[PDB]
Write a protein that binds this DNA or RNA. Structure first.
Ligand SMILES: [Zn+2]
Lengths: 146, 140, 80, 118, 28, 23, 157, 205
RNA sequence: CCCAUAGUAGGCCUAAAAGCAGCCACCAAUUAAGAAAGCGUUCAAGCUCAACACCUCCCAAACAUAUA
């Protein structure tokens, strides 16, 4: 990457460009996640994979720089949203309730003051619907609504 | 600002085509009419003349003129005072090729009108295209 | 701002960021609104000098930077 | 440690608890965050109370439930224990507790372009 | 209103497979 | 030629004008 | 109730079971398919005629002017027969590689504006570009020899 | 005449006989006026229903308002209101026979083309007021071209060919698989589950 | 994101209604801006689009991870 060194003098200094491991198991892919056989085999738990695709200030990297697929970049963006609210990224701040599997913003959900009847019950959304088609090791599927 | 008009040289003060349209920037209309009158003596009288007046922020007048218009010139070239109505099939003037070529020599000369095409085919093509939208038939 | 003096070297390896800086903001469109600024651009890793009238001297070596960040920098220095 | 509870998401602002003092106008709905700020014992207590069967043994089962909001346990309770039950949710350790070997074991996927500001 | 669960669908599927057996064995 | 492609561009502009009647 | 109602009538539960069992199931592939691998000729012979016409090419960054300023510079350079032309670089880079212009490859990027000629009046463009405090002189090439501004001034004087 | 002709409230000859509301003239696919003829665009009916005279007047006003008679022409396909719908007197009790004829009505089955566009007209310039007047229609409708009609028919055939479910409505209904024609209509042997009452299911194979 | 000159304030009737009050052709310039797709003015002037050049008081409690 490059950095903007300012002091008035301002310059752009190129420092410490990384690279991948030289052995992808699944070449000739489209996105690097497909290149490593990770299409449906990750969650919000792994934060190294999520941290390789974020700015140091917690922001999201864009598409063409990362080269991700549409569905897969949406999966990374939503998983980064879910992992920031779960406290899994403490070193990406600009400068208390514990959570996990959080879809919406904390200050944008109204409480369910009146849940409906059994046929029209308002339920609490748990976990992103973008992660439906992941590998399941149980036989009961992911209950996305509680 | 930039102001473009089609005020004819026959009359200096028509009225509403020059009174309220110039009353926003703030002008001294007597200087405008004396300049328009000396331009009228500088050319053949009784013809519409477009203007290039630019109202400066220092409140001064700069009037630039070129050739006469394109509607009345072609209509008087065909001897027409009031043009056709439909202008798609109705015709009143029958203008030959040689008259168009003769009036095209003194046309591509101006700077304010930006008719500065270096070949001959461009200007004559433009004015035949203009005459096709009017009631003038191109003979030969 | 009262003066800007920018040099670029396309005989060597070129930098497009300073060229777009010339094209979109170092023109008469901005000078039609900002009359007091005086531009000068010369051609031979590029250099952008901004002489403010009051007390500031801004020096830029716009080799690796993009246009958007340097435009935001000049906007911040104009706002000050 | 019934103060360091973690609901799975927006439950913290969507799950409400409704009570009624019998006087008119005494209907109180309080969300999970506000009730956790009121008393950090009540969420787990209400969950266990709703989990237990609805008979006359339930309030005697609640008397055998000892909930403490912090690490502190009184010495009469602390010397009484036998076995620690395993935690049912595997806590996802975040980026800081990761060792350097665990970071180096995961391969990087992609070259960034050589000129980007981040 | 009454809704359809996975048990009802799977029970329907199993009955339909038994009926497909019965359809095949009645054709010879 | 040049006039052919200018004419084709003119029909493209006309098509964009007629599709933009209700917007 | 009738068989035809204004609202969607509720079904028998065995009918709902039949409708839910007989739902459409789209085929799911084992691998996702999305994660698997005359005008231009007019530009061609027009700019090719331009290469075979001139013996130097000149270029600047003429978009820092108003439309009337374009008309004024077009008239000031219409006094001589120099041609000013604008065409995209996505087709001009193949024009450079076809015309064996290897040292002109990192020269034509961005907004570029050709100033082709057959005999020099370039001091006139010099003091047009000095009477305005902008709009530099991008380098050119006379008969397969590159010219910077110092070369432009040396050829001008 | 490239305009919608005026539609009368009732035919010139009256119908003195009261007709029963045979609601099976809504239910099912259309067989009259299902395919295009010398036109290009239409408002396809994705469901059946009654068109009243108010609906006819609103359609004519909406089409003829944003109208280009020099470039487009429009032809009715749904005829004049002929079915008599009768209403009893307000706040009166039952019995005493069938009520007097209130208003005249056309019935429209699903898949019916209502009006036809034609001329030097393209898709995007006509979806505007066609979608407006189709949203103002009583039943579900859609602005459908010649290309889009065949496009959705090809869609229906590829849905009925590409499905991996071994059990379709036609198989269970025709074979009487679970003894389940006890809860089905005899019309389900020809509707094949795509029709339920007056409604139509496009997404259902 | 851009970017908008000119035959021309297209003629007809209209005090003038100029692409935008209405009829008709809707040619043409460099290399490209439509005798005109929406604000806007009595009319103008100004503004956006394509195209050019970068591209009565809620109501089981709960739970997305252990092989059906
Ligand atoms: Zn992929």
């Amino acid at each position: 990457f490059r950095e903007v060194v300012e002091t008035t003098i301002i310059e752009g200094r190129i420092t410490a460009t990384p690279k991948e491991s030289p052995n992808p198991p699944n070449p000739s892919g489209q996105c690097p996640i497909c290149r490593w056989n990770l299409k449906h085999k990750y969650n919000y738990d792994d934060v190294l994979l999520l941290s390789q695709f974020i700015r140091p200030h917690g922001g999201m990297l864009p598409r063409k720089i990362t080269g991700l697929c549409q569905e897969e970049h949406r999966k990374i963006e939503e998983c980064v949203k879910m992992a920031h609210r779960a406290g899994l990224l403490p070193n990406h701040r600009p400068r208390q309730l514990n959570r996990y599997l959080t879809r919406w913003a904390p200050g944008s959900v109204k409480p369910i003051y009146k849940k409906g009847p059994r046929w029209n019950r308002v339920r609490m959304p748990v976990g992103s619907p973008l992660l439906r088609d992941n590998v399941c090791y149980s036989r009961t599927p992911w209950k996305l609504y509680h | 600002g930039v102001i473009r008009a089609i005020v004819r040289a026959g009359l200096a003060m028509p009225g509403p085509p020059l009174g309220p349209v110039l009353g926003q920037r703030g002008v001294s209309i007597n200087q405008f009419c004396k300049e328009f009158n000396e331009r009228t003596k500088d050319i053949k009288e009784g013809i519409p003349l477009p203007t290039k007046i630019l109202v400066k922020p220092d409140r001064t007048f700069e009037i630039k003129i070129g050739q006469p218009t394109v509607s009345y010139f072609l209509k008087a070239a065909a001897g027409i005072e009031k043009g056709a109505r439909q202008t798609g099939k109705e015709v009143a003037g029958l203008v030959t090729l040689k008259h168009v070529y003769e009036i095209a020599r003194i046309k591509a000369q101006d700077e304010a009108f930006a008719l500065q095409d270096v070949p001959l085919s461009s200007v004559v093509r433009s004015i035949i295209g203009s005459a096709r939208s009017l009631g003038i038939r191109v003979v030969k | 701002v009262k003066q800007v003096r920018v040099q670029f070297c396309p005989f060597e390896k070129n930098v497009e960021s300073t060229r777009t800086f010339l094209q979109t903001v170092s023109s008469e469109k901005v000078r039609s609104t900002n009359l007091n600024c005086s531009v000068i651009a010369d051609v031979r890793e590029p250099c952008v000098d901004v002489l403010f009238g009051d007390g500031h001297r801004l020096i830029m070596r716009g080799a690796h930077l993009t246009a958007l960040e340097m435009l935001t920098a000049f906007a911040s220095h104009i706002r000050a | 440690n019934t103060r360091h509870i973690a609901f799975s998401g927006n439950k913290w602002e969507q799950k409400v608890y409704s009570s009624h003092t019998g006087y008119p106008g005494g209907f109180r709905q309080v969300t999970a965050a506000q009730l956790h700020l009121r008393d950090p014992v009540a969420i787990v207590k209400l969950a266990i109370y709703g989990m237990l069967p609805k008979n006359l043994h339930r309030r005697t089962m609640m008397e055998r439930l000892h909930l403490f909001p912090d690490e502190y346990i009184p010495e009469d309770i602390l010397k009484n224990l036998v076995e620690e039950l395993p935690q049912p949710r595997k806590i996802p350790k975040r980026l800081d507790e990761y060792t350097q070997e665990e970071i180096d074991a995961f391969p990087r996927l992609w070259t960034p372009p050589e000129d980007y500001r981040l | 209103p009454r809704f359809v669960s996975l048990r009802a669908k799977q029970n329907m599927i199993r009955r339909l497979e038994i009926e497909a057996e019965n359809h095949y064995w009645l054709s010879m | 030629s040049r006039e052919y492609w200018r004419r084709l561009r003119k029909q493209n502009i006309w098509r964009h004008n007629r599709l933009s009647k209700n917007k | 109730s009738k068989a035809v109602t204004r609202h969607r009538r509720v079904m028998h539960f065995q009918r709902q079971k039949l409708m839910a069992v007989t739902e459409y199931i789209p085929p799911k592939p084992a691998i996702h398919p999305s994660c698997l691998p005359g005008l231009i000729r007019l530009l061609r012979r027009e700019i090719a005629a331009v290469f075979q016409d001139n013996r130097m090419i000149a270029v600047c960054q003429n978009v820092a002017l108003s439309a009337e300023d374009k008309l004024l510079m077009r008239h000031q350079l219409r006094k001589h027969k120099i041609l000013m032309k604008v065409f995209p670089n996505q087709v001009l880079k193949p024009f450079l590689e076809d015309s064996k212009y290897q040292n002109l490859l990192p020269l034509f990027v961005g907004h570029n504006m050709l100033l082709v000629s057959e005999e020099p009046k370039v001091k006139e463009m010099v003091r047009i570009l000095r009477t305005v405090p902008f709009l530099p002189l991008l380098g050119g090439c006379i008969d397969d020899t590159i010219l910077s501004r110092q070369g432009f001034i040396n050829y001008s004087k | 005449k490239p305009k919608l002709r005026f539609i009368e409230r009732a035919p010139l000859v009256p119908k003195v006989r009261r007709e029963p509301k045979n609601l099976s003239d809504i239910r099912g696919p259309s067989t009259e006026a299902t395919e295009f003829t010398e036109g290009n665009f239409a408002i396809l009916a994705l469901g059946g229903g009654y068109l009243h005279w108010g609906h006819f007047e609103m359609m004519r006003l909406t089409i003829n308002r944003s109208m280009d008679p020099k470039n487009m022409f429009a032809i009715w396909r749904v005829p004049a209101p002929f079915k008599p719908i009768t209403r009893k007197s307000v706040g009166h009790r039952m019995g005493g026979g069938k009520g007097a004829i209130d208003h005249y009505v056309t019935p429209v089955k699903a898949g019916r083309l209502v009006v036809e566009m034609g001329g030097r007209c393209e898709f995007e310039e006509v979806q505007g007021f066609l979608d407006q007047v189709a949203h103002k229609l009583p039943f579900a409708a859609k602005a459908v071209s010649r290309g889009t009609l065949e496009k959705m028919r090809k869609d229906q055939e590829e849905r009925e060919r590409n499905n991996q479910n071994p059990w379709t409505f036609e198989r269970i209904a025709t074979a009487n698989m679970l003894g389940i024609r006890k809860v089905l209509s005899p019309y389900d042997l020809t509707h094949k589950g795509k029709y339920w009452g007056k409604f139509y299911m496009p997404k259902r194979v």
